[PDB]
Design a protein around this ligand. Sequence first.
Ligand code: WJD
Ligand code: WJD
Lengths: 412, 412
Amino acid sequence: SRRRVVITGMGMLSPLGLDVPSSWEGILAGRSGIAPIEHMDLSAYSTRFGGSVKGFNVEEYLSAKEARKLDLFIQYGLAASFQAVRDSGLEVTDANRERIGVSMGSGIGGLTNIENNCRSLFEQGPRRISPFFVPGSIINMVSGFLSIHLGLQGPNYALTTAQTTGTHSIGMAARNIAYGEADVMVAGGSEMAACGLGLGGFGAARALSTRNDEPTRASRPWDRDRDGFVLSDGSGALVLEELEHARARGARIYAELVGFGMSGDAFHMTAPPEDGAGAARCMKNALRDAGLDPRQVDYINAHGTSTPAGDIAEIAAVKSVFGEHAHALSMSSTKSMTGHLLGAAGAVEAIFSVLALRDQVAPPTINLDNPDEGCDLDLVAHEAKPRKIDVALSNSFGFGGTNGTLVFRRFA
Amino acid sequence: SRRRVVITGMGMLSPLGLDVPSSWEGILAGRSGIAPIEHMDLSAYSTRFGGSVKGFNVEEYLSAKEARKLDLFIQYGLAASFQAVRDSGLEVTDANRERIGVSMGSGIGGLTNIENNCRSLFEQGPRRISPFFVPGSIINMVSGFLSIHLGLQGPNYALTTAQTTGTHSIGMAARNIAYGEADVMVAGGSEMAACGLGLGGFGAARALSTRNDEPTRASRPWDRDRDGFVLSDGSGALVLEELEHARARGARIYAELVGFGMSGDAFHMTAPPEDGAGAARCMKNALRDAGLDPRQVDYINAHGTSTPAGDIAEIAAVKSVFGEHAHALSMSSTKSMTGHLLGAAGAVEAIFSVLALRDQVAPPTINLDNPDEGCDLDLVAHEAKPRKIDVALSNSFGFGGTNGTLVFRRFA
Ligand SMILES: COCC(=O)Nc1ccccc1
Ligand SMILES: COCC(=O)Nc1ccccc1
């Protein structure tokens, strides 16, 4: 047997805003957070735009001294974690601190501060490198720093499963609570890969939209004119909590995390299989974990990256899993608005899945002007769609063919 | 309900050998794998030596054409995983590939790859960045490439918890099996942070021994003259397996994995607390998990990194957990010989811990000439000690106050 897991706190930085309510307001209004990148010369790059976090003030969270030590991806993670802990109302004590852990991940982590330290290293050699360089750059430091600032003494770790990180972090945090290893986890991921190596690195694989003339139109999942994903920055954090623990302290509960699914495609390094066999197993695995028949799913937050091979794989996967129900469920890609936050994607997208339940509204897929061949599902093109949502899936399909699925349900 | 987990295979690259038996011969013979570094110019660096993998032949495992595209940390992880899977004698099939997962972790991952592409970006421009840069450098592609080559469709992920990564990777892989998400997991870690950024970053923090004139005497855990850790390279992989599934196929079983603990110090970003309180909480968690009397523990493979603060803290954690029994058990740091494989440290040390069980011998702590104030336990100074070992415990501690404990016992 098993303990039930509920969402009691949520926090976020996105290209749409500096917290959940402002980001969600963007999602439902079909607003784009995509813009040419400022403060960085991208002249020599085939992509010149993305989702940046706009107007971020780290000193709302940290002294300027402790922020100088930390890559932007750590800052962003800590912001979402702090938002989420505050949102939860949870009081940490000597009595419960050993039962409260953190699992915040990143796809690449401290790329920006690595890039800035290479400069120092080749020009001037090793003596300029900062003392805080290693601890200020490694992925596990969001979990490290948050545990120290808050006195969290419970399972302390970080996933890095590329674009699946946020989904795997939340999912395996849930498992820690379900199986009695913790009563509370702060879980999700953060990403800031908007640096020469990120844009350059993805640019070299021609994985990125090159639609420099219309950055708001670049992210157009399931549309025949899409030409790869948009690179976006930010963070999601949820406070996961055991149900009796949450009820006892009178917490506001958003939704129940009822299921977690993992799988491997075991196919290709970057490209899913045409038929989404992997994503289909992962989804089947998640619904079984939740004890739910596929018919009961109402909303799917797709991966929906706006890559040609990835979007079509997800359609195949859903038709396969849901058969006669695949047209009844609504499925949108919020990346149409936010772009791809990589290891943070599944975190912000689990929050969007939780709010979709709170507000009975399916977020739009904007720019879905001309569906491709076989993209005839309910993809919620252009505008939000109010509707019944008892169960919501969030999907993440990553490099290595690492799949993750979270199943949320209305709580009462 | 919770299923039992055994070790059916192991693999390794270490500074002492290109497999497990060749590494173990060096461990038992009290042999150092620390030497001046050859592959680069370290004259501008405060540390010019480490534990390199010597004579690694990647064409023993992969085509040169694929090897070229992958960072040494991925090559090291795949070689270790390949040895482990071959040693398990497991046959991957359509009947079982869905139940066979992989969790192989790293601290920093493709830092060499990141440094070279950094060199390409600044000296030439973004257009010179490898198309293979991202899939070839990110931490989760040991799990991804392994799954692609062997057809492993099970849970597919990677931890990055700095110097704890290997212990964490293995423990959580055993949770996957314990709770029935998988029947087999390939778990452990790989590290190749021996480049300008790694040696420089850790130098910047003054974390590294500077004993360039006697590199084999540098790593001296608990010795009064220790001046920091020795940076080393390699990989550890184990096949983790549900017990009945092991019995069902007549698998050779090296030992059983009975216990796993985690905790946060919640103390400092890089310094362990002087009393070892977080380490203590972790080992108690692990022992309760294993259903053990602390006095059953015969051998501890210590973190034993050869830093002033970390070493003293381990004694304090062990004396606090084990009381008067702390004097009867043998504790040793094989890092005295291998150096600190960082993210791979827990994986190779989990293997040493298992081989301590098979051969009934505690590996020595070499260079322990003058034990420090309070380091008055059986630290197996100088020479291997053949002795009764029914239970072995492996510790790892990391930046972020992140702790991991693995408990192995003999299986009949
Ligand atoms: C070395 O590659 C650069 C990069 O941005 N990598 C990544 C970032 C997030 C998710 C997956 C991969
Ligand atoms: C920028 O960091 C360089 C590095 O090697 N970091 C690390 C490697 C292994 C474990 C923990 C940290």
